[PDB]
């Protein structure tokens, strides 16, 4: 349970070595005061793409775009790969490299429509780029209203005493926001590793 530090629960250990190609990665950022920084990344095999959360800062150099890395002892939290100090992350061997299908790359950088987001299971982590229609700011949280051409949903953010400086008509890129579906209009909500980046 110390190999599983900073790892979301339910996450499954994968000793099975898998080589991926790095599509993108964010700048390292503080997600919890007193904790090591983390960054978000998007990777891809031939078959499909994965969203990745990395909690070992000693790996930032490794996570460069268009690079191929072989990972092992990584975790799987409901389709999301979580990498910590337990994992082995090395530069890939050439024979393990591959060509990533175009449709997979684009499906990785594609942003779902809000109306189709709303149909995903509650608890699903939501990534995407959305236009901002409306903003409400108070002391507990900031509530954005993001819009499509067809639909709008509310993205409420409670955690980092409002470091963010985005307003109406701007474009927000979201990371690891929780889709909450209950008795009422579904919302997107900030979680532990949730990250905004306009």
From Swiss-Prot:
Residues shown, of full length: 46 to 242 of 445
Outcome after substituting residue 143 to E: Abolished DNA-binding
UniProt-recorded name of the protein: Interferon-activable protein 202
Impact upon substituting residue 141 to E: Abolished DNA-binding
Positions of the HIN-200 domain: 2-198
Region spans: Required for homomultimerization: 38-45
Quaternary structure annotation from Swiss-Prot or TrEMBL: Homomultimer; homotetramerizes (via HIN-200 domain 2), enhancing affinity for double-stranded DNA (dsDNA). Interacts (via HIN-200 domain 2) with AIM2 (via HIN-200 domain); preventing activation of the AIM2 inflammasome. Binds to several transcription factors, including NF-kappa-B p50 (NFKB1) and p65 (RELA), FOS, JUN, E2F1, E2F4, MYOD1 and myogenin. Also binds TP53/p53, the hypophosphorylated, growth-inhibitory form of the retinoblastoma protein and the p53-binding protein 1 (TP53BP1).
Effect of substituting residue 185 to A: Strongly reduces affinity for DNA
Basic residues biased stretches: 2-7
Phenotypic consequence of residue 140 to E: Does not affect DNA-binding
């Amino acid at each position: 349970m110390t190999p599983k530090k900073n790892i979301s629960k339910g996450a499954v250990l994968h000793e099975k070595p898998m080589t991926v190609m790095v599509l993108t990665a964010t700048e390292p950022f503080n997600y919890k005061e007193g904790k090591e920084n983390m960054f978000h990344a998007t990777v891809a095999t031939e078959s499909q793409y994965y969203r990745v959360k990395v909690f070992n800062m000693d790996l930032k150099e490794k996570f460069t775009e268009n690079k191929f890395i072989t990972i092992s002892k990584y975790f799987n939290s409901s389709g999301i790969l979580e990498i910590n100090e337990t994992a082995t992350v090395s530069e890939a061997a050439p024979n393990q490299m591959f060509e990533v299908p175009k449709n997979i790359i684009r499906s990785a950088k594609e942003t779902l429509k809000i109306s189709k987001i709303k149909e995903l299971d509650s608890g699903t982590l939501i990534y995407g780029v959305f236009a901002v229609e409306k903003k409400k700011v108070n002391d507990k949280s900031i509530t954005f209203k993001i819009k499509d051409n067809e639909d709008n949903i509310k993205v409420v953010w409670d955690k980092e005493q409002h470091n963010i400086n985005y307003e109406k008509g701007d474009k927000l890129q979201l990371f690891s926001f929780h889709l909450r579906k209950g008795n009422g209009k579904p919302i997107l909500h900030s979680g532990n590793h949730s990250f905004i980046k306009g």
